[PDB]
Each structure stands twice: as structure tokens, then as C-alpha cells.
Amino acid sequence: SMSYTWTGALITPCAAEESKLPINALSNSLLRHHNMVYATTSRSAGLRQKKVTFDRLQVLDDHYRDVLKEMKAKASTVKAKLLSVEEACKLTPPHSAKSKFGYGAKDVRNLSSKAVNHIHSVWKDLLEDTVTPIDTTIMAKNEVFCVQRKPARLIVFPDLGVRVCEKMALYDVVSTLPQVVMGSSYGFQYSPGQRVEFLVNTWKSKKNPMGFSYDTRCFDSTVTENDIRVEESIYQCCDLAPEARQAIKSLTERLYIGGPLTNSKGQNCGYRRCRASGVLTTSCGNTLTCYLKASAACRAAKLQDCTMLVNGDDLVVICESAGTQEDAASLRVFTEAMTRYSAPPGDPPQPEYDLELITSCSSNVSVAHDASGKRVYYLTRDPTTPLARAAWETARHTPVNSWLGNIIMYAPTLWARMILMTHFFSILLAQEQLEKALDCQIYGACYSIEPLDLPQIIERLHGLSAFSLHSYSPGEINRVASCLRKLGVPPLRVWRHRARSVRARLLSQGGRAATCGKYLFNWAVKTKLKLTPIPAASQLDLSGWFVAGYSGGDIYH
Ligand SMILES: CC(C)CCn1nc(-c2cccs2)c(O)c(C2=Nc3ccc(O[C@H](C)C(N)=O)cc3S(=O)(=O)N2)c1=O
Incomplete structure (x- = not known):
């Protein structure tokens, strides 16, 4: 069937949208080629709609069926619990789109009974009705990139009340089932x-x-509908509470499989017969x-x-x-x-x-060397989108701090260390906002992170090695250098200079800031300090970080 059927109604914004990189006094120290950087807006959603709108045919053979049988056998070994309303509520991001029923993410998080009441009624509906299509909102994502222009991605999502319901029914399933079914492939x-x-x-x-x-x-x-029913049948293999089974059947028939699409103005935009990208x-x-x-x-x-x-x-x-x-x-x-x-x-x-x-x-996997001279493998990526986004975040407060995510996930890399750490630590110093916790996303889930914990976070995720990597690969260096020329980012030698300043400024604050100075910037100085384990690092609750992915899933940890 057609992945989508459209009425002609536009995909509409809520807030007015900026496509052009906002420039402030700090922008030029990161990036000079400002016009390389853009944000997608609803105004390119029509192009996306066209791209994503096509017929799907499917031809399933015995290999398909064998694998499914295997997956179902593994899935039959999972036991998942229903979450309480309160628990589901606590997983809701503070910025999560407000309900159309006159309450918002913060009402959910601090558990106002206006929200809880509604959520209970959604849940009772889900139990009572397994056929009525659940309304969804289609929005254009505003994401930042460097010009290669991509159209906006689309986010399709049910009301806030339904999302808490998805969490109650399915959060534990989507947290545990995938690793059981897919093992080391997950x-x-x-x-x-x-x-x-x-x-x-x-x-x-x-x-x-x-x-x-x-x-x-x-x-x-x-x-396809078949794909979404198949995956339901995988969920139903789990040992589930009877209400969980019912809710899952119902969300599947009424939401997952497909549904009407409504823009932010309340018009009907059409119908979806494929995966909704804004569901648990x-x-x-x-x-x-x-x-x-x-x-x-x-x-x-x-x-x-x-x-x-x-x-x-x-x-x-x-x-x-x-x-x-x-x-x-x-x-x-x-x-x-x-x-x-x-x-x-x-x-x-x-x-x-x-x-x-x-x-x-x-x-991609790459290689550099630890302090010992011993070769080390680590993960890196082209830094263009990270830097594009850092440039946006240099001028704008954003709901998710990609810079901070990137420093965490790409701590061992050349570009995260020399550029991201230097630039943003510089900015935090200047604003004495070192101590303020920032929201970032990891595998689609929102975490509140304190920059001052980066050294312990990086020691835990990466080992102290990440503070000592050197002699990066020629292809890695060339990719970074080439990226800097594209975006007009100052060369790594400027960043090293800056970093020496950022480091000393941090050392001078003492404490956690000084630890940041010490570990994060040991690379910056000719004559280095001894990077020994960080006691507080072993005190960190890094449970939940790399368990499952939760993109579009409206998940806060
Ligand atoms: C191990 C890691 C470095 C690999 C690169 N990386 N990095 C991130 C980061 C999160 C925050 C900063 S960097 C990150 O969150 C992801 C990441 N990977 C996805 C892949 C495919 C995905 O597909 C979704 C399920 C879909 N198609 O609907 C989603 C993700 S993600 O969970 O958003 N995040 C990721 O793959």
C-alpha cells in the first residue's frame, strides 16, 4: 500500500523557524563559513513528503519465516513488566510536546492529576478499544546540517497521554527484548x-x-502493516501482564500500524500506513x-x-x-x-x-596511540555535522546539546578534544556555567549531564586512554583538517593554543573544573600531568546509558 495518503493540507510549524545559522559574538571563533550551516524547517516538508510517499510490495519467503520463528523463540523467553503511570511519567522529557488535552510534559513529570487522570483514561480506552485509529501529529524536524540541502525529516507522534501509555505497556519490552532476540547484533x-x-x-x-x-x-x-503486525507478534511472545498484551494489541492496531495525520494547526494532512517515527x-x-x-x-x-x-x-x-x-x-x-x-x-x-x-x-573505527605507544582502536566520524551543530549551539540555546553528546560519545577523537572541549569549555568558563547541567541525547534518550563530570564520564566510558590518545591516523587527520577548511574552522594549532588557556582557566577554578582542566586538556600542553584514575568516576550511575535505543520514543533518563 501507499506509505502515505495526503489531503493537501500543509505540514505546519508551531514556532517560527530559523533555517539560517544564528550568529553571536562567539560564532566566528568556531566557524567562519556561516552559510554552510542550516536548519531544516517545515517549509521543506513537502519535499520530504514526496520522498517518503510510495507503494510497498512485500514478498516473504521461508528464510524470512525461519528467522522470525527463531526471533519469536528468543522473544518467548523475555518477561516484561507494566510500568506504573508514575514511572512512565518520570520517563517523559521536560520539553516533550504538550497534550492537546490541556496539560504539558512538566504536568506529567511532576505528576499533576490533570495529566495522570487523562493518562488513565487513555489507558482504559486502549484496553476497551482495539480498532479506533489514534490521532497523530505530523511535524517537520528542525535539525542542523552542513550544506552538501536535506528536507526536514518528519516526526509523527500521538498525544502525550498516549505516549505515557506506550511507556506503561512497552517501555520494559523495548528495553529488554531487543538484546534477547538479537543478541550481540543489537x-x-x-x-x-x-x-x-x-x-x-x-x-x-x-x-x-x-x-x-x-x-x-x-x-x-x-x-509495512505486515512488519508492524509481525513485530507485535514478537512482543506478544513475551511473558506479559494481560493488560500489557491488550494495550500492545491496541496500540498496534490503532497507532503503530497506521493512522490519520494532523498538522499543528489541527488540519488533517492524510493517512500513514508505515512506521511512525515518534512512537516508543x-x-x-x-x-x-x-x-x-x-x-x-x-x-x-x-x-x-x-x-x-x-x-x-x-x-x-x-x-x-x-x-x-x-x-x-x-x-x-x-x-x-x-x-x-x-x-x-x-x-x-x-x-x-x-x-x-x-x-x-x-x-568508523580508527586507530591512534595511547601514552604507552600502543595502538588503540576507537570510534570516530566525520565531524562536519557535529561542528555545524556546535555552531548553532554556540549562538542558540537548544533543547538537546549535541556538543555535549558528541564530547561524551566521541571523547577519544581528535576533533572532539581539540575543538568541542576547547570551545564549549571556553564558553562555559566565560559564563561561569560550568556547574549547570545540560540536556543531551544518547541513543535517542535524553540525559541531564553536568559538564564538570565529563572527565569521570569519559574515564568510565572510554578509559583514561581517551585523555592520552595521540598520533592519530593520516586519514582521520586529513578528514578533520579538510572539514575545518570547509566550514572555516580555525586550524588545530589555534585550538591547541586556546586549549592551553582554557586549561589554565579551569585549573584556576580548582575542584571539578580543575579536573576538567587536568584530564580534558592534558593533550594541550608540552609538559603533561600524570592522569591517574578519578575516584569519583567509579561513583557514577552509568546504568541505563547503553541498554536500548529510544529515538522518537520520547524518553528521558
Ligand atoms: C557508539 C556511537 C558513537 C555511534 C554513533 N552514534 N552516536 C550517537 C550519539 C548520541 C549523542 C551524541 S553521539 C547516537 O545516539 C547514535 C544513534 N544511533 C542510531 C542509529 C539508528 C537509529 O535508527 C532509528 C531507530 C530509526 N531508524 O528510526 C537511531 C539511532 S539513535 O538512537 O538516535 N542514536 C549513534 O549511532
């Missing part, structure tokens, strides 16, 4: 370093490794579905000694090469199978034979 269980460890060991476990990433064209849109099960359903299709496609393609790594629609496969010609033919067959399953490629997959050249989750 990408969201990995910190970046564990992700590197997995990729590195898997690569090394092959006599002749070949790897490829598979780009599905608009994954959400290729997701977006990440988990995509992951399962991507895994299901891809594992079946690996069998179709007779890929040998095949290891998958899946995060939502992001798939990377490492397997035994059969030589470039056979590999290419394998990927064609893999692609035809995926296509038959309604997951056709954007860019057709290409075999790669160097781990460091495989991009997956927009990242």
Missing part, C-alpha cells in the same frame, strides 16, 4: 568502545573479512524489523560466517569474503532480498575490506 547495548571492540573482534574473527553497511531508502516508509517502539520495531529482513537476506544471499550489527535502520554486516566479484554478487542478492522484503537500498551496498572505511551509525 547495537544499542554497546558503548562506543564496546562497539569498537565488537567490530574489531568480528572483523578479526574472519579469515578474509568483508564488511558492508546497508542503507535502506527511507526505512520508516518501507515498514520506533527504535525497537525498526531494529527488529531491520534485523529480521537482513538476517533473512543473509540467508538468501548465502553470506558466509556472517555477523550483523543493527541500530534501527542502520545495518552493518561483517562476513567472509569470497573475493570482490563474488562479494558484489552476494550484495546484489542481499539487496534483492531486502528489496523483496520491502527494504530497498538508498545507495546500493559496497563491500569494504578495510574496517576503518566502514561507516555504520555514521561512524
Whole structure:
């Protein structure tokens, strides 16, 4: 069926939207090529609508069915609990879109009974009605990029009351099921370093490794009613409370499978018959579905000694090469199978034979050296989008601080250390806002993070090694340098200079700020300090960080 049917009503903004990089007094110290940076707005949503609107046909064979049977067997071993209203409420982000029923995320979080009452009525409705399509709002995402212009992505989501209901019914399922079903293939269980460890060991476990990433064209849109019912049947394999089963059946029939689309002005924009990107099960359903299709496609393609790594629609496969010609033919067959399953490629997959050249989750493994001179593998990515976004965040307060996420997730990298840490620590110093906790996202989930904890956070996620990496790869350095020329970011030598200042300014504050100065900026100075373990690092609640992915899932930790 058509992934979408549109009425003609526009996708409308709430607030007026800025597409142009806001410039303040700090902007130029990060970036000079301001016109390279933009934010998507609803005003390009029509282009997106066109892209995402197509017919899906699906042809399911025995490999598909075998894998599903296997997945269901693993899923039958999971037991999940219903969350209480209160618990579901506490997982709601403070910025989460307000209900149309006259209450907002903050009413939910501090548990006003106006919200709780409504949520209870939503839940009772979900139990009583398993057929009535649930209304959804379609919005254009405002996200920041560097010009290559992408149209806005679309966010489709049910009312706040329904979302708390999704959490009650499904939060535990989407938190536990994926790792049980997909085992080590489930990408969201990995910190970046564990992700590197997995990729590195898997690569090394092959006599002749070949790897490829598979780009599905608009994954959400290729997701069919059948896919969404299949994933429900996987959920229902779990040991669930009877109300959980009912709510899941009902959210599936009424929401997940499809539904009417309403813009922010209240007009009907049409109808959706594919994955909604603003629901709890977006990440988990995509992951399962991507895994299901891809594992079946690996069998179709007779890929040998095949290891998958899946995060939502992001798939990377490492397997035994059969030589470039056979590999290419394998990927064609893999692609035809995926296509038959309604997951056709954007860019057709290409075999790669160097781990460091495989991009997956927009990242690649790279190598630098620790203090010992010993080679170390770590995760990096092209810094262009991070820096674009840092530039936006340099002038604008934003609900999510990508800079802070990037420093955390990419702490060991050259660009996060020399540029992100230097710039933003500089800004925090100047505003004496070092102590203020900032919201950032990790695997789609919102965390409140205190910048002063970065050293302990990075020691925990990455090891002290991340504060000592040097002698980065030529291809990594060239990518960064090239990125800096594109965006007009000052060279790494300026950043080193600045960092020496930022470091001393931090050391002078003493305490946590001084620890930030000490660890975060040890690289900056000729004559270095001894980076020993940080006692407080071992006191950090890093439980929940890399358990599952929660994008579009309206999740706050
Ligand atoms: C280990 C890590 C470095 C790999 C790169 N990386 N980085 C992040 C970051 C979060 C915050 C700063 S960087 C991050 O949150 C993600 C990340 N990966 C996704 C992949 C595919 C995804 O697909 C969704 C399910 C869909 N198609 O609907 C979603 C994500 S994510 O959970 O938003 N976040 C990620 O992959």
C-alpha cells in the first residue's frame, strides 16, 4: 500500500523557524563559513513528503519465516513488566510536546492529576478499544546540517497521554527484548568502545573479512502493516501482564500500524500506513524489523560466517569474503532480498575490506596511540555535522546539546578534544556555567549531564586512554583538517593554543573544573600531568546509558 495518503493540507510549524545559522559574538571563533550551516524547517516538508510517499510490495519467503520463528523463540523467553503511570511519567522529557488535552510534559513529570487522570483514561480506552485509529501529529524536524540541502525529516507522534501509555505497556519490552532476540547484533547495548571492540573482534574473527553497511531508502516508509503486525507478534511472545498484551494489541492496531495525520494547526494532512517515527517502539520495531529482513537476506544471499550489527535502520554486516566479484554478487542478492522484503537500498551496498572505511551509525573505527605507544582502536566520524551543530549551539540555546553528546560519545577523537572541549569549555568558563547541567541525547534518550563530570564520564566510558590518545591516523587527520577548511574552522594549532588557556582557566577554578582542566586538556600542553584514575568516576550511575535505543520514543533518563 501507499506509505502515505495526503489531503493537501500543509505540514505546519508551531514556532517560527530559523533555517539560517544564528550568529553571536562567539560564532566566528568556531566557524567562519556561516552559510554552510542550516536548519531544516517545515517549509521543506513537502519535499520530504514526496520522498517518503510510495507503494510497498512485500514478498516473504521461508528464510524470512525461519528467522522470525527463531526471533519469536528468543522473544518467548523475555518477561516484561507494566510500568506504573508514575514511572512512565518520570520517563517523559521536560520539553516533550504538550497534550492537546490541556496539560504539558512538566504536568506529567511532576505528576499533576490533570495529566495522570487523562493518562488513565487513555489507558482504559486502549484496553476497551482495539480498532479506533489514534490521532497523530505530523511535524517537520528542525535539525542542523552542513550544506552538501536535506528536507526536514518528519516526526509523527500521538498525544502525550498516549505516549505515557506506550511507556506503561512497552517501555520494559523495548528495553529488554531487543538484546534477547538479537543478541550481540543489537547495537544499542554497546558503548562506543564496546562497539569498537565488537567490530574489531568480528572483523578479526574472519579469515578474509568483508564488511558492508546497508542503507535502506527511507526505512520508516518501507515498514509495512505486515512488519508492524509481525513485530507485535514478537512482543506478544513475551511473558506479559494481560493488560500489557491488550494495550500492545491496541496500540498496534490503532497507532503503530497506521493512522490519520494532523498538522499543528489541527488540519488533517492524510493517512500513514508505515512506521511512525515518534512512537516508543520506533527504535525497537525498526531494529527488529531491520534485523529480521537482513538476517533473512543473509540467508538468501548465502553470506558466509556472517555477523550483523543493527541500530534501527542502520545495518552493518561483517562476513567472509569470497573475493570482490563474488562479494558484489552476494550484495546484489542481499539487496534483492531486502528489496523483496520491502527494504530497498538508498545507495546500493559496497563491500569494504578495510574496517576503518566502514561507516555504520555514521561512524568508523580508527586507530591512534595511547601514552604507552600502543595502538588503540576507537570510534570516530566525520565531524562536519557535529561542528555545524556546535555552531548553532554556540549562538542558540537548544533543547538537546549535541556538543555535549558528541564530547561524551566521541571523547577519544581528535576533533572532539581539540575543538568541542576547547570551545564549549571556553564558553562555559566565560559564563561561569560550568556547574549547570545540560540536556543531551544518547541513543535517542535524553540525559541531564553536568559538564564538570565529563572527565569521570569519559574515564568510565572510554578509559583514561581517551585523555592520552595521540598520533592519530593520516586519514582521520586529513578528514578533520579538510572539514575545518570547509566550514572555516580555525586550524588545530589555534585550538591547541586556546586549549592551553582554557586549561589554565579551569585549573584556576580548582575542584571539578580543575579536573576538567587536568584530564580534558592534558593533550594541550608540552609538559603533561600524570592522569591517574578519578575516584569519583567509579561513583557514577552509568546504568541505563547503553541498554536500548529510544529515538522518537520520547524518553528521558
Ligand atoms: C557508539 C556511537 C558513537 C555511534 C554513533 N552514534 N552516536 C550517537 C550519539 C548520541 C549523542 C551524541 S553521539 C547516537 O545516539 C547514535 C544513534 N544511533 C542510531 C542509529 C539508528 C537509529 O535508527 C532509528 C531507530 C530509526 N531508524 O528510526 C537511531 C539511532 S539513535 O538512537 O538516535 N542514536 C549513534 O549511532
